């Protein structure tokens, strides 16, 4: 059976088999969910890099900045899951901020064009995935986005934090649209997960000054977290997203679940 047994869940954001979305997809399939995966205009690129999930899953093209991809999402999901089936779950794990908005570009030097793209994909596309999929979501259904607690400013994250503040705000509005469908909308605020993107940042692609800043932020999590924080382990975070996809948090929406080791709840 498993936690998500029977549930039809669309999972966006997988880019690598170390993506938070990939582990979310993984844990979901292990828990019996039936997935529909999405990846940007690169349904063929997500093809190479996800033949690694426990079960096969239809993969669909979605560039969330593409209003056509969005108008047709519901259409192709249905095609994918079977006419007469609906989604039980939607995982939005799409986050992106041009590195001009997050990494060593001064916070002030991030062009709005880039911030705006960061917010399009990171925050707004949450409302657009909700708009696209809510009509093909079952009551008791669950939308989950990925958050990184922006409630305090932090070095390097910069405009991405801004985008996550925006996303949290968007989440409470999604929940209110979502609740007309009996659907809940929540975010999972993850502690830092050193994946493909994060390790190059800390590896100094976005330079010494930002890698340092991220490293020192990211190391504060484990010190802070009463239960610690392994940034190399997406599983706790994937399991939390699946808890949100399950029927075990039936009265939470508009909300944020911290899967951060309890870091956010401790000063030091």
Known binding-site residue numbers for substrate: 157
Nearer of residues 46 and 110 to a second copy, judged by Cβ: 110
Residue numbers 194-253 binding a second copy by CB under 8 A? 213, 216-217, 220, 225-229, 235-237, 239-240, 242-243, 246-253
The residue from 49, 63, 155, 199 that contacts a second copy (CB under 8 A) is 155
153 is a site residue for a second copy (CB under 8 A): yes
The residue from 97, 137, 178, 198 that contacts a second copy (CB under 8 A) is 178
Residue numbers 8-37 binding a second copy by CB under 8 A? none
What is residue 34's three-state secondary structure? Answer: strand
Contacts of 206 (CB under 8 A, 6+ apart): 99, 102, 103, 104, 156, 200
Binding string, 107-126, against a second copy, x = CB under 8 A? xxx--x--xx--xx--xx--
Least CB distance to a second copy at residue 170 (A) = 5
Conformation bin of residue 11: beta by default, left when phi > 0, alpha when psi is -120 to 50: beta
Conformation bin of residue 252: beta by default, left when phi > 0, alpha when psi is -120 to 50: beta
Binding residues: 19-20, 63-64, 94-95, 157, 164, 193
138 is a site residue for a second copy (CB under 8 A): no
Least CB distance to a second copy at residue 191 (A) = 7
H helix or E strand, kind and range, residue 244: helix 235-245
H helix or E strand, kind and range, residue 231: none
Nearer of residues 57 and 170 to a second copy, judged by Cβ: 170
The residue from 73, 93, 143, 170 that contacts a second copy (CB under 8 A) is 170
Instruction: Report how far residue 216's alpha carbon sits from residue 233's, in angstroms, rounded to the nearest whole number.
Output: 18
Q: What strands lie across the sheet with 137-147, from one edge to the other?
A: 59-61, 34-39, 8-12, 87-92, 137-147, 183-190, 255-259
268 is a site residue for a second copy (CB under 8 A): yes
């Amino acid at each position: 059976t498993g936690l998500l047994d029977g549930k039809r869940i669309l999972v966006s954001g997988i880019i690598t088999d170390s993506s938070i979305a990939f582990h979310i997809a993984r844990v979901a399939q292990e828990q019996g969910a039936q997935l529909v995966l999405t990846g940007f205009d690169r349904l063929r690129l997500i093809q190479r890099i996800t033949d690694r999930l426990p079960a096969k899953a239809p993969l669909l093209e979605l560039d969330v900045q593409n209003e056509e991809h969005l108008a047709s999402l519901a259409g192709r999901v249905t095609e994918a899951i079977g006419a007469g089936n609906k989604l039980d779950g939607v995982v939005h794990a799409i986050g992106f901020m041009p590195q001009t908005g997050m990494g060593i570009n001064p916070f002030f030097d991030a062009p709005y064009a880039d911030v705006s793209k960061g917010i399009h994909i990171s925050a707004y596309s949450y409302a657009s995935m909700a708009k696209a999929l809510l009509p093909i979501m079952n009551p008791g259904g669950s939308i989950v986005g990925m958050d990184f607690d922006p409630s305090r400013a932090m070095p390097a994250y910069n405009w991405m934090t801004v985008a996550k503040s925006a996303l949290e705000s968007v989440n409470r509005f999604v929940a209110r649209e979502a609740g007309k469908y009996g659907v809940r909308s929540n975010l999972v605020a993850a502690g830092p997960i050193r994946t493909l993107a994060m390790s190059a940042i800390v590896g100094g692609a976005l330079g010494e000054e930002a890698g340092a800043q991220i490293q020192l932020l990211e190391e504060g999590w484990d010190q802070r977290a009463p239960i610690g924080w392994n940034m190399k382990d997406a599983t706790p975070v994937a399991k939390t997203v699946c808890a949100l996809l399950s029927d075990w948090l039936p009265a939470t929406t508009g909300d944020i679940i911290y899967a951060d080791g309890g870091a956010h709840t401790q000063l030091l």
